[PDB]
Amino acid sequence: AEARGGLERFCSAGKGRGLRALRPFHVGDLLFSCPAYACVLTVGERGHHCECCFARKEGLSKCGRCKQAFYCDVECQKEDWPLHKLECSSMVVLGENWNPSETVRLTARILAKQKIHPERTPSEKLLAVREFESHLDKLDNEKKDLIQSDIAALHQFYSKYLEFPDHSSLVVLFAQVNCNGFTIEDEELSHLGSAIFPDVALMNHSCCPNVIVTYKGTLAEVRAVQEIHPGDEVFTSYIDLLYPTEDRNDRLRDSYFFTCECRECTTKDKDKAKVEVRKLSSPPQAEAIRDMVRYARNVIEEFRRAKHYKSPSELLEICELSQEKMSSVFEDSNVYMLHMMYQAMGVCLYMQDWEGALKYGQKIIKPYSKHYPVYSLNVASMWLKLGRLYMGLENKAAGEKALKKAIAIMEVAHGKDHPYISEIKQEIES
């Protein structure tokens, strides 16, 4: 018998172990699904999504003791209890002082799961957590310090409720989480939480992926976005494909310890349109473009840092400031301009500035459609957010057209029967 029908684990030369198709898969076909081995809901979503299954529901029943964990029903509460019990009492005693990072909370759950079920689970038919690559030999000083900081935080927040393996085993585990972890995003690409999907972790990376990972609660689903021929390796993208080749590879080396050699990374064809410059009298010299690229990659970091000391209103100004400055060199379609417009849209949405968010959305959509693949969750989510803004702003004609563009991509990536599709169709009707 086949562990996963039409697929097998194999040795991909220069890429360790990988996933291969045995039979053809065509666009929109489901290769496999994988329940979460461990998952944790992001703090920001407490009271809005079930802590166990991540369902977005009104009227979630809360935990009687800590009054902090929220659930669909007693069944979700019971499934989560082995994990929630590690935090419940600590959240009662320490208030806002109990703040382990999301990665630390996830790793605590993996430790709890490993102890109870040493044998392979249904989320490990092809690759087990114990087999995950860690790359300890490639970790630099800063990366080693970060893991050590995470281990101290784990002892700090869980020592009273969780027994630990030796320090070296914890180092290996946090390192495995870094190169095999997933984040779960909703239909608008909002961050819901972090998870471990061992069989999904088997797939190698390509900047030209042939599959897309989506979620049905905490169940990961893998669907083909191009034909996958018998014998082909199955590739997902580990990163945001919007960025130029150098940016993507700096991210792949930093988190996954490899340099990509895919067709897009070899030819760099998309880089010209991604770093688009404006047609002026001059025009911009290569040195001046390099300076704006460096300014752009720094403002990305400036914005992230500013979240700690600046108000949303101020963060919006950083985005406004940057766009104005970069526009002397950069076209609106330039990816660095889009990064700032996207961040500005999120701030607008947060400050209830529906109109400001809609104007940003209207500028992002066309360049997103060009830069991203045909089936991209980033493009689908942008059409959806645009559709929802128009619908909310009493423009049903433009709203319906945008929601329909989102559904058409989502039918491929999420499957025609996905609950997100039914939800959007119910928004078109009512």
Residues in contact with Zn ion by the rule CB under 5 A: 50, 52-53, 55, 63, 65-66, 69, 72, 76, 88, 207, 260, 262, 265
Tell me how far, at minimum, the Cβ of 360 lies from Zn ion, in Å. 29
* Residue closer to Zn ion (CB basis): 72 or 201: 72
Please, what is the minimum distance in Å from the beta carbon of residue 9 to ligand SFG? 9
Phi-psi region of 352 (alpha: psi -120 to 50; beta: other; left: phi over 0): left
C-alpha span between 195 and 103 (Å, rounded): 9
Given a contact cutoff of 8 angstroms between Cβ atoms, the answer to whether 256 and 242 are in contact is no
Q: Which does 256 bind (CB under 5 to 8 A by kind): Zn ion, ligand SFG, none?
A: ligand SFG
Quick one: 244 or 387, whose CB is closer to Zn ion? Answer: 244
Interface with ligand SFG (CB under 6 A): 14-18, 133, 179-180, 201-202, 204-205, 256-258, 260
Beta carbon nearer to Zn ion, 70 or 342 = 70
Closer to Zn ion at the Cβ: 206 or 322? Answer: 206
Indicate the residue among 39 and 299 with the shorter CB distance to Zn ion.
39
Minimum CB–partner distance for residue 179 and ligand SFG (Å): 4
Would the annotation count 47 as a binding residue?
no
Q: Which residues fall within 8 angstroms of residue 377, CB to CB, at 6 or more apart?
A: 185, 189, 212, 214, 409, 413
Q: Are 322 and 299 in contact (CB under 8 A)?
A: yes
257 binds, among ligand SFG, Zn ion, none (CB under 5 to 8 A by kind): ligand SFG
| Residue 369 identity | S
When CB distances to ligand SFG are compared, the closest residue is 16
Closest to ligand SFG by CB, 37 or 330: 37
Min CB(99)–Zn ion separation in Å:
16
| Nearest to Zn ion of 51, 187 (CB atom) | 51
Q: How far is the CB of 324 from ligand SFG (least distance, A)?
A: 38
**Cβ of residue 12: shortest distance to ligand SFG, in angstroms?**
6
Q: Is 15 annotated as a binding residue?
A: yes
Q: Is 256 annotated as a binding residue?
A: yes
With contact defined as beta carbons under 8 Å apart, do 403 and 387 qualify? yes
Report the partner that residue 72 touches, choosing among ligand SFG, Zn ion, none (CB closer than 5 to 8 A by kind): Zn ion
217 carries a ligand binding annotation: no
Provide the edge-to-edge strand list for the sheet that holds 211-216.
30-35, 219-224, 211-216
Residue 140 CB, nearest distance to ligand SFG (Å)?
15
Asked whether residue 17 is marked as a ligand-binding residue, the answer is yes
69 or 153, CB closer to Zn ion? Answer: 69
Helix H, strand E, coil C: the string for the chain is CCCCCCEEEEECCCCCEEEEECCCECCCCEEEEEECCEEEECHHHECCECCCCCCECCCCEECCCCCCCEECCHHHHHHHHHHHCCCHHHHHHCCCCCCCCHHHHHHHHHHHHHHHCCCCCHHHCCCCHHHCCCCHHHCCHHHHHHHHHHHHHHHHHHCCCCCCCCHHHHHHHHHHHHHHEEEEECCCCCEEEEEECHHHHCCEECCCCCEEEEEECCEEEEEECCCECCCCEEEECCCCCCCCHHHHHHHHHHHHCCCCCCHHHHHCCCHHHHCCECCCCCCCCHHHHHHHHHHHHHHHHHHHHHCCCCCHHHHHHHHHHHHHHHCCCECCCCHHHHHHHHHHHHHHHHCCCHHHHHHHHHHHHHHHHHHCCCCCHHHHHHHHHHHHHHHHCCCHHHHHHHHHHHHHHHHHHCCCCCHHHHHHHHHHHC
Whether residue 407 contacts residue 425, with contact meaning beta carbons closer than 8 Å, is answered with yes
| The entry of ligand SFG, Zn ion, none that residue 180 binds, CB within 5 to 8 Å by partner kind | ligand SFG
Question: C-beta of 203: minimal distance to ligand SFG in Å?
Answer: 6
- Between 133 and 302, name the residue whose CB sits nearer to ligand SFG: 133
Least gap, CB of 347 to ligand SFG (angstroms): 33
Consult the annotation and say whether 26 binds a ligand: no
53 annotated ligand binder: yes
265 interface partner picked from ligand SFG, Zn ion, none, CB below 5 to 8 A per type: Zn ion
Is residue 117 annotated as involved in ligand binding? Answer: no
59 contact choice in Zn ion, ligand SFG, none (CB below 5 to 8 Å, kind-dependent): none
Q: Which does residue 66 bind out of Zn ion, ligand SFG, none, counting CB within 5 to 8 angstroms by kind?
A: Zn ion
The reply to whether 135 sits in an annotated binding site is: yes
Binding site for S-adenosyl-L-methionine: residue ranges? Answer: 15-17, 135, 204-205, 256-258
Binding site: residue ranges? Answer: 15-17, 50, 53, 63, 66, 72, 76, 84, 88, 135, 204-205, 256-258
Binding site for Zn(2+): residue ranges? Answer: 50, 53, 63, 66, 72, 76, 84, 88
